Design an enzyme around this catalytic site. Structure first.
Site, PDB file in Angstrom:
ATOM      1  N   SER A 118       0.810  -1.251   0.046  1.00  0.00           N
ATOM      2  CA  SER A 118      -0.046   0.156   0.092  1.00  0.00           C
ATOM      3  C   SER A 118       0.861   1.308   0.056  1.00  0.00           C
ATOM      4  CB  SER A 118      -1.066  -0.010   1.249  1.00  0.00           C
ATOM      5  OG  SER A 118      -2.019  -0.856   1.003  1.00  0.00           O
TER       6      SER A 118
ATOM      7  N   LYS B 252      -0.118   4.189  -2.476  1.00  0.00           N
ATOM      8  CA  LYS B 252      -1.375   5.057  -2.366  1.00  0.00           C
ATOM      9  C   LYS B 252      -0.793   6.505  -2.169  1.00  0.00           C
ATOM     10  CE  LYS B 252      -3.896   0.946  -1.232  1.00  0.00           C
ATOM     11  NZ  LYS B 252      -4.313   0.293   0.022  1.00  0.00           N
TER      12      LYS B 252
ATOM     13  N   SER C 192      -5.664   3.675   4.131  1.00  0.00           N
ATOM     14  CA  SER C 192      -5.424   2.408   3.220  1.00  0.00           C
ATOM     15  C   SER C 192      -6.458   1.743   2.588  1.00  0.00           C
ATOM     16  CB  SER C 192      -4.422   1.525   3.915  1.00  0.00           C
ATOM     17  OG  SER C 192      -3.470   0.980   3.002  1.00  0.00           O
TER      18      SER C 192
ATOM     19  N   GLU D 185      -5.233  -3.001  -6.557  1.00  0.00           N
ATOM     20  CA  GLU D 185      -5.240  -3.831  -5.222  1.00  0.00           C
ATOM     21  C   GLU D 185      -6.339  -4.908  -5.183  1.00  0.00           C
ATOM     22  OE1 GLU D 185      -3.396  -3.919  -2.535  1.00  0.00           O
ATOM     23  OE2 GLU D 185      -2.741  -1.849  -1.868  1.00  0.00           O
TER      24      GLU D 185
ATOM     25  N   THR E  82       1.351  -3.391   3.714  1.00  0.00           N
ATOM     26  CA  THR E  82       1.398  -4.650   4.268  1.00  0.00           C
ATOM     27  C   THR E  82       1.338  -5.647   3.234  1.00  0.00           C
ATOM     28  OG1 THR E  82       0.459  -4.094   6.514  1.00  0.00           O
ATOM     29  CG2 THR E  82       0.668  -6.567   5.608  1.00  0.00           C
TER      30      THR E  82
END
Length: 269
Positions: free
Chosen positions: A47, A50, A108, A144, A215
């Site tokens: 992430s 982002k 996130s 994602e 993560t």
């Protein structure tokens, strides 16, 4: 040199004892290296992309090709794993560009991230933005959550600590965004909701710190951002791989890296 050796030795101890690989880069606001460890080894971004995605969006706002209050319509097809704000706004039928960017940075939120990717031309356009601001390394190949698969050896969806740190510095300190867009993203990073137990847990409590966590599968745990210490500004990127640690132990690992960083910085006086 003496301080840089302690930095290296202490990270190698964590690596050895936690069975982990630790990539770190610290740069000054112009991207000059302060210290690093495995700084040009590739790690899955997870992430952490982002934050650059938000920068790309603000660049389009700055340039007039996007508007922050533009309503982005969607249906349940856009809900994926970990889409807390997207789920809440689903019944209303939209999120604005700015709402989606804030959820992507501060929560996130994956759906919000994919909503923005839908709008700006997908992973290819994210990668094109990296290249535009001088980052020839970072690459987004997938949306994602599959961009976080972190298959060993896969160079898709990776960065290096040094490339990402220099991108953070470009966005926050090197004029990539207007002062207003820069301040907005800075404050979102300071008020991030997902980083309380990672890098900023390892820093002195009076340092101003803002960051974006990541993560991944297979033990990826990352944190990138900026901190102000002793009236000096820095950009930092931390990527780690610890397949055998628990989630909480990976949190502790990144906070420990934050402590090692602190001790280097404090040894500049």
């Amino acid at each position: 040199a003496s301080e840089k050796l302690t930095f290296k030795t202490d990270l190698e101890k964590l690596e050895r004892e936690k069975a982990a690989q630790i990539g770190v880069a610290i740069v000054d606001p112009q991207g000059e290296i302060v210290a690093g460890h495995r700084m040009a080894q590739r790690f899955a971004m997870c992430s952490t992309f982002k934050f650059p995605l938000a920068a790309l969006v603000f660049e389009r706002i700055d340039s007039g090709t996007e508007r922050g209050d533009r309503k982005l319509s969607y249906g349940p097809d856009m809900i994926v794993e970990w889409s807390p704000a997207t789920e809440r706004f689903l019944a209303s039928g939209h999120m604005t560009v700015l709402e989606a960017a804030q959820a992507a940075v501060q929560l996130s939120d994956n759906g919000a991230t994919n909503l923005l990717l839908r709008e700006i031309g997908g992973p290819a356009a994210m990668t094109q933005y990296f290249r535009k601001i001088g980052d020839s390394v970072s690459r987004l190949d997938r949306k994602e959550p599959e961009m976080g698969d972190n298959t060993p050896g896969d160079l898709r969806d990776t960065t290096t600590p040094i490339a990402m740190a220099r991108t953070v510095a470009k966005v926050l300190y090197g004029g990539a965004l207007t002062s207003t867009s820069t301040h907005t993203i800075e404050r979102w990073l300071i008020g991030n909701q997902t980083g309380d137990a990672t890098l900023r847990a390892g820093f002195p409590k009076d340092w101003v710190v803002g960051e974006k966590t990541g993560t991944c599968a297979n033990g990826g745990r990352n944190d990138i951002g900026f901190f102000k210490a002793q009236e000096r500004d820095y950009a930092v990127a931390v990527y780690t791989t610890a397949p055998k640690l628990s989630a909480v132990e990976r949190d502790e690992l990144v906070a420990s890296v934050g402590q090692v960083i602190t001790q280097l910085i404090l040894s500049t006086d």
